[PDB]
Design a protein around this ligand. Structure first.
Ligand code: GLC
Ligand code: GLC
Ligand code: CA
Length: 516
């Protein structure tokens, strides 16, 4: 892996359940057998959406957790674990959505202003999720929902391995900047979603708070605004994305815009920890979307990310570490293109996020954005997951592998692996002063024969005059590898004479000794 390390010893694979309730797909018995089959193939748990539109449909505080309980009961019967996603967003209307579960319709009547929803640069209203600006309503409803959920699921704490939170549209922490009705669907640029009267005044107040008076504002922005009412979000999103973002106004606007999501992250993190920490004692996380299109567009750089709320990922992630939430990213199966008209750079994106996450010490999890129907994609996922320290991978989605034996088998071999610590010992290595020894192998968890970025470093043993190290390996899988010497400058000086192999890697910790 990167930095001479190996795969994450805590790696676990998860399976995303269908969007529709199980009884609308098959029966519970078959479901239980499907789970036992999944477990046999390396899946640790099944993650599932529990829709707010289902749990508090009739009215405020009129809960119904019977479905969530019946689902959990079956997960228990199968001897599996589950990861519930408290989906406080709408199901249906997004790419791949085969459901129709809006959030409770009564929530919209709790405000007379337009503080609860979104409005784009061109007036398109969006109600897939509550506007994070309405922190008073979010604090009340999410607060009540989480606590009620914890109480109702207390009997099933032993099957709950983790809890995922929904931070916005499609359960991702972002603005609904790419939708069909707003004319911003992939791969178009996104539109900013801060044009409700409420959003405009919040921005205005934020600016005035930072500068004190319109006079200081004009001085800081180099503008000549005639009155406080002139403080507004961009009038032309495209012109803003072309060069307006470079100005002091631009920096302030984007800071406030992304700031709304960071504060939201801290709020739901606090509500979630207060409601689950004592009862479940399990990790909690949220998701960041992989808005990979228009990444390297020369005309409108990061033309889709910025409107979605992503302008400074490093700053964004600090909010996660601060809220004590793990992060889940997407598009781990795609590769870079960066060509007109999509200007898509998914891999470069995932690499940047993973790097930042690791620096800050944030537990990183991944998912694939689109269904995988070929072994080649699993390989790319494996490359990113095992060489960028991912702690988990969730496969979207259930049916893709449950009704395709060959694909399921390829997932088990490549991704449904159990990491096991092993000692590698290499003797008779002709190292000179300054040289270092590394190992690299055929599988992704071994760097796929890469000697530049992914090799696994070994450590000289002065007492036995050999090189060794504890490496995390995929249990019960065949591997081939070779040690090599790297000069003090970074060039590969030589390789081990004979290629080594372990067919397969034992599941009990032991050691593999070979000679140069
Ligand atoms: O199932 C996980 C997610 O998949 C996608 C759906 O659009 C989203 O609503 C759901 O939460
Ligand atoms: O906009 C939603 C979807 O659009 C396209 O299908 C992209 O390939 C995918 O990554 C994204 O999730
Ligand atoms: Ca409520």
């Amino acid at each position: 892996a990167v930095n001479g390390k190996g795969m994450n010893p805590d790696y676990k694979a998860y399976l995303m359940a269908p969007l529709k309730k199980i009884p609308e797909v098959t029966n519970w018995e078959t479901f239980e057998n499907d789970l036992r089959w999944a477990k046999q193939n390396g899946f640790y748990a099944i993650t599932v959406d529990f829709w707010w539109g289902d749990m508090e449909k009739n009215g405020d505080q009129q809960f119904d957790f019977s479905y969530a309980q019946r689902f959990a009961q079956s997960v228990k019967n199968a001897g599996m674990k589950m990861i519930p996603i408290i989906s406080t967003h709408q199901c249906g209307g997004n790419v791949g959505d085969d459901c129709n579960v809006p959030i409770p319709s009564w929530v919209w009547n709790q405000k007379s202003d337009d503080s609860l929803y979104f409005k784009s640069e061109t007036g398109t209203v969006n109600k897939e999720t509550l506007n994070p600006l309405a922190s008073d309503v979010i604090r009340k409803e999410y607060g009540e929902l989480y606590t009620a959920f914890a109480a109702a699921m207390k009997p099933y704490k032993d099957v709950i391995a983790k809890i995922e939170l929904s931070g916005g549209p499609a359960g991702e922490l972002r603005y609904p900047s790419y939708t069909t009705s707003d004319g911003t669907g992939y791969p178009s640029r996104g539109k900013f979603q801060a044009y409700t009267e409420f959003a405009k005044s919040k921005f205005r107040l934020w600016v005035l708070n930072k500068y004190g008076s319109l006079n200081e504002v004009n001085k800081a922005w180099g503008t000549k605004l005639i009155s406080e009412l002139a403080i507004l979000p961009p009038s032309d999103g495209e012109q803003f994305l072309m060069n307006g973002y470079l100005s002091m106004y631009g920096k302030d606007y984007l800071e406030w815009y992304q700031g709304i999501l960071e504060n939201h992250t801290k709020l739901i993190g606090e509500l979630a920890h207060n409601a689950f920490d004592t009862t479940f004692q399990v990790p909690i996380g949220a998701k960041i979307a992989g808005v990979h299109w228009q990444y390297n567009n020369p005309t409108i750089p990061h033309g889709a990310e910025k409107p979605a709320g992503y302008n400074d990922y490093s700053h964004l992630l600090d909010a996660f570490k601060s809220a004590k939430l793990d992060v889940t990213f997407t598009c781990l199966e795609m590769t870079d293109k960066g060509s007109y008209p999509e200007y898509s750079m998914p891999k470069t994106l995932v690499q940047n996020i993973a790097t930042l996450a690791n620096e800050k010490g944030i537990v990183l999890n991944g998912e694939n954005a689109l269904s995988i129907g070929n072994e080649e994609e699993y390989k790319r996922v494996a490359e990113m997951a095992f060489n960028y320290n991912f702690a988990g991978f969730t496969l979207l989605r259930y049916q893709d592998v449950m009704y395709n034996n060959s694909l399921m088998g390829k997932f088990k071999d490549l991704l449904g692996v159990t990491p096991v610590m092993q000692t590698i010992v290499v003797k008779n290595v002709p190292t000179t002063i300054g040289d270092t020894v590394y190992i690299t192998g055929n599988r992704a968890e071994l760097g796929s024969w890469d000697t530049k970025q992914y090799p696994i470093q070994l450590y000289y043993d002065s007492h036995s005059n050999d090189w060794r190290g504890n490496v995390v390996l995929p249990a019960e899988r065949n591997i081939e590898f070779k040690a090599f010497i790297k000069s003090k400058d970074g060039t590969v000086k030589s390789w081990q004479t004979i290629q080594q192999s372990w067919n397969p890697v034992p599941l009990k910790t032991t050691s593999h000794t070979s000679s140069w």
